[PDB]
Amino acid sequence: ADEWNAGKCISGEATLKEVQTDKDLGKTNRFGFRNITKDGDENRVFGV
Amino acid sequence: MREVISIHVGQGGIQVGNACWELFCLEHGIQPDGQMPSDDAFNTFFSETGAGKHVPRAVFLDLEPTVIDEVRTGTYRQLFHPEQLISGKEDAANNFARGHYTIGKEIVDLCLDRIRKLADNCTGLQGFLVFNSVGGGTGSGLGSLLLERLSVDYGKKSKLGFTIYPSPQVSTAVVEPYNSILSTHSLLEHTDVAVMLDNEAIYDICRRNLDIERPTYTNLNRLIAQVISSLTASLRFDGALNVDITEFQTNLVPYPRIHFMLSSYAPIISAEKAYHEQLSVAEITNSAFEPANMMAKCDPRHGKYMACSMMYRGDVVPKDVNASIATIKTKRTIQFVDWCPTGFKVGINYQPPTVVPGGDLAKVMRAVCMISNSTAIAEVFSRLDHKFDLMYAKRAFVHWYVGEGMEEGEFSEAREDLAALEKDYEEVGIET
Amino acid sequence: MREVISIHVGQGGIQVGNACWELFCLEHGIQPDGQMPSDKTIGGGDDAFNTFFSETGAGKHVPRAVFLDLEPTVIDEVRTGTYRQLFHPEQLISGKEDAANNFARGHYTIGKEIVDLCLDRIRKLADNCTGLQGFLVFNSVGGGTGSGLGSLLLERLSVDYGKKSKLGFTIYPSPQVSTAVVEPYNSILSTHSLLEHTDVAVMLDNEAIYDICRRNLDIERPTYTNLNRLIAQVISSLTASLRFDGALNVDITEFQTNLVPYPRIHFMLSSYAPIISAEKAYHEQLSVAEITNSAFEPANMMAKCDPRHGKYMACSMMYRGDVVPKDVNASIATIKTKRTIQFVDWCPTGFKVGINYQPPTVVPGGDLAKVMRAVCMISNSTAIAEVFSRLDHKFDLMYAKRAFVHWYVGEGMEEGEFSEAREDLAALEKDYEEVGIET
Amino acid sequence: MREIVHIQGGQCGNQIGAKFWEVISDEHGIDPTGTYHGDSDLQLERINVYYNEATGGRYVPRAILMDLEPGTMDSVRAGPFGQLFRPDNFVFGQTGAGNNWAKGHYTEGAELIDSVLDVVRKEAEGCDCLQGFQITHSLGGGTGSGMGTLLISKVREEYPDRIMETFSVVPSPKVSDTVVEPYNATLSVHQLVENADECMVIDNEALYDICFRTLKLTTPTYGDLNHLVSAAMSGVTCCLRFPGQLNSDLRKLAVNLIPFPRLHFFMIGFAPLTSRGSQQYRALTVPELTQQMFDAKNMMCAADPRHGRYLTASALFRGRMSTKEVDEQMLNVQNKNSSYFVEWIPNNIKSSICDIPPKGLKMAVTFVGNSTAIQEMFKRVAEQFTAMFRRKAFLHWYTGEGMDEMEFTEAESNMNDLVSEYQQYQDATA
Numbered sequence A: 001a002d003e004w005n006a007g008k009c010i011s012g013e014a015t016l017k018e019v020q021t022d023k024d025l026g027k028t029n030r031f032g033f034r035n036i037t038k039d040g041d042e043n044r045v046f047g048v
Numbered sequence B: 001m002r003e004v005i006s007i008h009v010g011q012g013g014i015q016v017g018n019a020c021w022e023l024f025c026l027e028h029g030i031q032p033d034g035q036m037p038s039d040d041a042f043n044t045f046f047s048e049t050g051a052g053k054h055v056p057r058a059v060f061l062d063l064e065p066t067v068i069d070e071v072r073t074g075t076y077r078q079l080f081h082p083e084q085l086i087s088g089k090e091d092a093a094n095n096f097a098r099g100h101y102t103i104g105k106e107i108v109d110l111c112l113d114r115i116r117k118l119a120d121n122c123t124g125l126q127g128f129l130v131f132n133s134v135g136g137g138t139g140s141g142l143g144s145l146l147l148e149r150l151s152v153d154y155g156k157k158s159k160l161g162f163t164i165y166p167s168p169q170v171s172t173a174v175v176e177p178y179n180s181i182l183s184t185h186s187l188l189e190h191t192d193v194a195v196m197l198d199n200e201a202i203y204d205i206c207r208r209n210l211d212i213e214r215p216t217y218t219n220l221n222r223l224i225a226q227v228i229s230s231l232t233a234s235l236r237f238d239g240a241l242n243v244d245i246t247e248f249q250t251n252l253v254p255y256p257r258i259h260f261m262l263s264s265y266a267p268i269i270s271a272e273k274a275y276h277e278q279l280s281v282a283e284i285t286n287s288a289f290e291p292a293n294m295m296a297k298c299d300p301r302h303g304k305y306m307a308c309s310m311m312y313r314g315d316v317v318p319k320d321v322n323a324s325i326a327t328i329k330t331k332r333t334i335q336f337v338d339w340c341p342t343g344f345k346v347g348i349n350y351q352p353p354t355v356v357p358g359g360d361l362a363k364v365m366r367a368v369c370m371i372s373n374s375t376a377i378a379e380v381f382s383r384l385d386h387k388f389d390l391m392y393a394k395r396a397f398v399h400w401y402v403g404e405g406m407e408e409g410e411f412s413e414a415r416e417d418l419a420a421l422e423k424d425y426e427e428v429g430i431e432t
Numbered sequence C: 001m002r003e004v005i006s007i008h009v010g011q012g013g014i015q016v017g018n019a020c021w022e023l024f025c026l027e028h029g030i031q032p033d034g035q036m037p038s039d040k041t042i043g044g045g046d047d048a049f050n051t052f053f054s055e056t057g058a059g060k061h062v063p064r065a066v067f068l069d070l071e072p073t074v075i076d077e078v079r080t081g082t083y084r085q086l087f088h089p090e091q092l093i094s095g096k097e098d099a100a101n102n103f104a105r106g107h108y109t110i111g112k113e114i115v116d117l118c119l120d121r122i123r124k125l126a127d128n129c130t131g132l133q134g135f136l137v138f139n140s141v142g143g144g145t146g147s148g149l150g151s152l153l154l155e156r157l158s159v160d161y162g163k164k165s166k167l168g169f170t171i172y173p174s175p176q177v178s179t180a181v182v183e184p185y186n187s188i189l190s191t192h193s194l195l196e197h198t199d200v201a202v203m204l205d206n207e208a209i210y211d212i213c214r215r216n217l218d219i220e221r222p223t224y225t226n227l228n229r230l231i232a233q234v235i236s237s238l239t240a241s242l243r244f245d246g247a248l249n250v251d252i253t254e255f256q257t258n259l260v261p262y263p264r265i266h267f268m269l270s271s272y273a274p275i276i277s278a279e280k281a282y283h284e285q286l287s288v289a290e291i292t293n294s295a296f297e298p299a300n301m302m303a304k305c306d307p308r309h310g311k312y313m314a315c316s317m318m319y320r321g322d323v324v325p326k327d328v329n330a331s332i333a334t335i336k337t338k339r340t341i342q343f344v345d346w347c348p349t350g351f352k353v354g355i356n357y358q359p360p361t362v363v364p365g366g367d368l369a370k371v372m373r374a375v376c377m378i379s380n381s382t383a384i385a386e387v388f389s390r391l392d393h394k395f396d397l398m399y400a401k402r403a404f405v406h407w408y409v410g411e412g413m414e415e416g417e418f419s420e421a422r423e424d425l426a427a428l429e430k431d432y433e434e435v436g437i438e439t
Numbered sequence D: 001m002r003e004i005v006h007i008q009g010g011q012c013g014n015q016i017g018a019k020f021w022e023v024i025s026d027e028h029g030i031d032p033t034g035t036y037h038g039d040s041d042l043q044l045e046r047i048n049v050y051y052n053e054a055t056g057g058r059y060v061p062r063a064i065l066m067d068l069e070p071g072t073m074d075s076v077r078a079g080p081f082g083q084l085f086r087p088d089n090f091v092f093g094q095t096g097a098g099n100n101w102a103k104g105h106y107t108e109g110a111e112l113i114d115s116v117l118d119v120v121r122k123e124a125e126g127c128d129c130l131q132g133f134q135i136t137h138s139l140g141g142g143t144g145s146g147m148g149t150l151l152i153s154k155v156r157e158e159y160p161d162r163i164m165e166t167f168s169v170v171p172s173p174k175v176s177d178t179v180v181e182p183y184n185a186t187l188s189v190h191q192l193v194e195n196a197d198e199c200m201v202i203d204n205e206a207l208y209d210i211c212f213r214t215l216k217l218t219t220p221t222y223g224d225l226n227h228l229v230s231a232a233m234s235g236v237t238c239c240l241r242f243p244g245q246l247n248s249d250l251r252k253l254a255v256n257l258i259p260f261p262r263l264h265f266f267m268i269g270f271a272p273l274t275s276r277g278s279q280q281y282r283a284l285t286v287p288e289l290t291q292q293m294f295d296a297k298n299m300m301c302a303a304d305p306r307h308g309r310y311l312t313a314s315a316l317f318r319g320r321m322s323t324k325e326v327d328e329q330m331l332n333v334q335n336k337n338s339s340y341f342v343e344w345i346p347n348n349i350k351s352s353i354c355d356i357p358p359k360g361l362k363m364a365v366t367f368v369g370n371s372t373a374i375q376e377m378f379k380r381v382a383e384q385f386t387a388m389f390r391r392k393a394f395l396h397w398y399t400g401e402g403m404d405e406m407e408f409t410e411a412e413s414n415m416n417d418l419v420s421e422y423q424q425y426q427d428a429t430a
């Protein structure tokens, strides 16, 4: 006269906050380009 | 009274058709189940079943089932006709011979039967729209076979193909030059209008304007769908200067050989920072001709233009359009061929584009969609020819095509046709 | 209203009767003591049991069967067994001295003082019956009392009732494996007797069942009980149509009008499927197509006969369970498309199908597993003449020098019988080989 | 539809399959009794790919176990997830081959293979639309190395159109546990190259190196190696069983990976792999996964990928990730290492995306590559074979069962021709 790792370490623990998909797919989190609209005026076509 | 029939085949065809079809139903107010909650423009894309819901005038085909399967299990299950969704058993697997001579002939009969039972209902058939990714086996083979069969079955009816070509350096498969050239040979003498829709250009667009560092296929297909709706709005919405699909083969084709063109859209812009500016007609139409805004990797600065057809939708005014065209003509960086003194066809519709909830785009009064045919398109044909020749020098991958019914020399005449086509572009481009 | 009378004569007959009556008792839910465990009341609008059991009026039921044997061993054993309260005591006819494997003892010396009692009991049983359909008879041929007494009873009922149908689930000897040495003699004699008295005969030799048990149940040490259970399952699957629902109900009358083209040709060999233990059952498909295909394969025949050496004339297939007629006829069409089974030219259509809605019952302590679908097939074939030819060979080779003849002669049997038995067996095989020719 | 049937032989293939089926059952949420207790609807959508239905509602794998000794299967039946296998499917001999290729391919093989051929024929005809066969075996053992390839030949003679995929554990000269492995390895590869559509080589020494250097746990075991190679097995067909952006089945991979008919030997890899203590420091990003993928030590074979030039390669991504970043990353990888990619076939990398990541993992990558670097395995195997054959050592054992030296000379000539023709393209330029 071998911990929990016995070949099962390929996927273990991994709380869900890791599990959500990346940080953005097909959307921009930049404050200068963020898609979300202004709060007060949700819908009125904004051009001229 | 005016109807158009839509064909989708291949992975890319099905994926882009899905995106087009939520956009159309949201535009016309049809719920996903097909019912209408609360005039008759939808006749172009839908047909009333007699009482209640409306059925889209489309057909989906694929040899590999899973995409049609997820469509049939998705939310739009109640919309499409269950036996309008033709599914095979095994995928052609990037092999054009498999999709053209081995398995596709066993499904082409069912597809033509469905075409008959769709066209019999229609009374004022305008034409055919077809979607298929060229760089795929089943898409290429089935598109070739279907266009060939429909040409003899109908004859002079107008057909438009929205082909997605491989990008200059970014591509998915490793043998797609082969089936792409073969499909070019097939559709060159069978299609009236062919639109270039490579992926990398749209990647660049969504990177530059929307600032999307990591887009997926959904955004690409949404822009493609927006282009389709912009093109088609002229038949379903009243406007000052209407244009029909049949008035494309009579405005955009100087010679029967030259019928490949590329698209552009404006404005494709985000939902917070477009919002400081007026989006005036002059600036939107300048963005339209901005070379980096082309949806294909071809430099319009490298060649002359033959013809440009632009459709405006919104509160645009013909005087402003004319003022913009005068500016474009005066600008020196854009030059036209001598034998085309005027080359701008313009249509105006008062129906502004609709916005899909949760999408990238925003909603504005004005939009323009532009279709250009120009001498510079031959660069992509030359690069594909070069890539083909590099692997054809040592007959790589040829044996698997030979073992599926292809004759050895079938690549030769495709090569000769491509050389003749690029020579024809060169001959057209010269000055008198 | 509809009833069948059962006769079990000989040791093999009794040992098959035990298993078949156990199976019937379990299937109808009657306890071994004979009392129905109540909970079948509420005006009970169905006499599912009159085919085999008749009420005493309050509680117990009695079978419509008679047991005959000359040795009191098995009869007394049954009388003292777990079913002592079930059978009617004096319908257990027991003899005094065994027939000693001799046809003459059972047909010419000792059978007279027993056949009178047996006929009297059969009369008394039939009087209470009101809608008799026919007789089933179980016997072994290679035994003295079996062959002789069965022959005499067949002759007597043939004149007492006449047109009433009778079916014989006889046990003929296997080709090589067998018990006695004198069995060809009394076998030829008994087939002589039954040819012009039995409407339908079924081949039930032992070695085929042995090999079936070896191949399917993977049991290397089988005994007579397993064979008896298989035969009982066959009988129940055949007769369930009279007492259970079905989309195509088939009476016993649909045998002597559908499986027997000519009066002389009424010998058939049966088959049964599926045959799977409890271990391999849950890992299998057990579809209608598979159980139908497995039924026609040669190695599943109840009898040592190779069907590929002969043609087919008439096949009756009964399904029980959740079977679907669409699947039934699809499987039949596939069989017809398949080549290695060929039918006779003058019989273009040759299948009679019946459907029954009661799935087979499972016996505790048994070998078979509980399944939701099963099929029983009865086939008429011209290849059956092989067993008769080989039996004739085994007969005449040792008859050439007159062995064991004195044992029959001194008991009162005329020597001339063997010659005429040889004659009509030759005539029968001639008829079989004549029918097989093409038209 | 387009499902495939699994058949395994030899103790090595049996041990591989025992873990592979366990991994697949865990992925599809099936308990040892064959009853579905999964959670997601996608878990049951394409169960027909590997499983068959039985009465009562249970599932059974369509796998056939075939061998000459009853001990190995008698052991695997007693293990967990051993009840799934069909008892009829087990076929075994009585004597065994004793690591003799002649015994396993000429004397006992011809007599025994009829039953397993009948069983596989029934299984294949049962399927509505067959896709192909997948087989696991080791070339170092006599019985597997011989009877497996004989069965390959027989199945070729019956289904010329289907695709066959083989997972071969080839013997490496460093960690050698058999003294006669060159002989049976060469005799196997002779028939294997002619018939198999796809063969993929695994090396025990490479597995040991991965387990020690990347995983960094003290006691590697055959169970761990089997689990790793089983994950490699599953990743290949995850896309056939789950939806994705660009679905690509085995035939699509065959089209995009094989330029010439005889060059169908592959080298594989799986990402990501990290130690237990470093699980929370790492960040799951496509750059990290591709850097680990194209790493040399991540490979499943001791052959150095930087010793030659890649003819082509493909990657199967699993998870929900953007396509553009994958494409640009692949382009960057092909650009920065242009010297190690053959130049006359542009854009020699295929990528496919599947939307379902493995059990409990964010994102996974399976890499397959056809490269000239595999030639060293064959070269050193041939050196060992010719050294042992020059003195005719251990030769009478093979010659005493109908085999003669003509077969060995032909096999050596064929194998040398293979390696020469395979390196012929290494220095080829346009």
Ligand SMILES: Nc1nc2c(ncn2[C@@H]2O[C@H](COP(=O)(O)OP(=O)(O)OP(=O)(O)O)[C@@H](O)[C@H]2O)c(=O)[nH]1
Pocket: B009, B010, B011, B012, B013, B015, B016, B064, B091, B092, B093, B094, B095, B132, B133, B134, B135, B136, B137, B138, B139, B140, B164, B171, B172, B173, B199, B217, B220, B221, D246
């Ligand atoms: N723009 C765009 N291109 C796509 C899409 N899907 C596939 N493609 C293109 O199609 C090429 C490969 O062909 P696929 O469409 O994936 O498959 P296919 O056309 O059905 O032909 P098979 O591979 O035989 O099934 C890829 O290189 C992509 O560039 C899509 O949704 N949008």
Ligand SMILES: Nc1nc2c(ncn2[C@@H]2O[C@H](COP(=O)(O)OP(=O)(O)OP(=O)(O)O)[C@@H](O)[C@H]2O)c(=O)[nH]1
Pocket: C010, C011, C012, C013, C015, C016, C071, C098, C099, C100, C101, C102, C140, C141, C142, C143, C144, C145, C146, C147, C171, C173, C178, C179, C180, C205, C206, C224, C225, C227, C228
């Ligand atoms: N399959 C099967 N055959 C049996 C069974 N019992 C007896 N036999 C057959 O009976 C034949 C011999 O006749 P027995 O039944 O023993 O005796 P018997 O028919 O009463 O005639 P005797 O001997 O004169 O009393 C044997 O060859 C067996 O084939 C049985 O339980 N199962």
Ligand SMILES: Nc1nc2c(ncn2[C@@H]2O[C@H](COP(=O)(O)OP(=O)(O)O)[C@@H](O)[C@H]2O)c(=O)[nH]1
Pocket: D009, D010, D011, D012, D015, D016, D099, D138, D140, D141, D142, D143, D144, D145, D169, D171, D177, D178, D204, D222, D223, D225, D226
């Ligand atoms: N990965 C792995 N390889 C194994 C295992 N058992 C044996 N092997 C390999 O099998 C090779 C020996 O082959 P052998 O057992 O003689 O094959 P057989 O003759 O068909 O049984 C060795 O080189 C081992 O690397 C296992 O459990 N896992």
Ligand SMILES: [Mg+2]
Pocket: B010, B011, B064, B091, B136, B138, D247
């Ligand atoms: Mg596809």
Ligand SMILES: [Mg+2]
Pocket: C011, C071, C098, C099, C143, C145
């Ligand atoms: Mg007796």
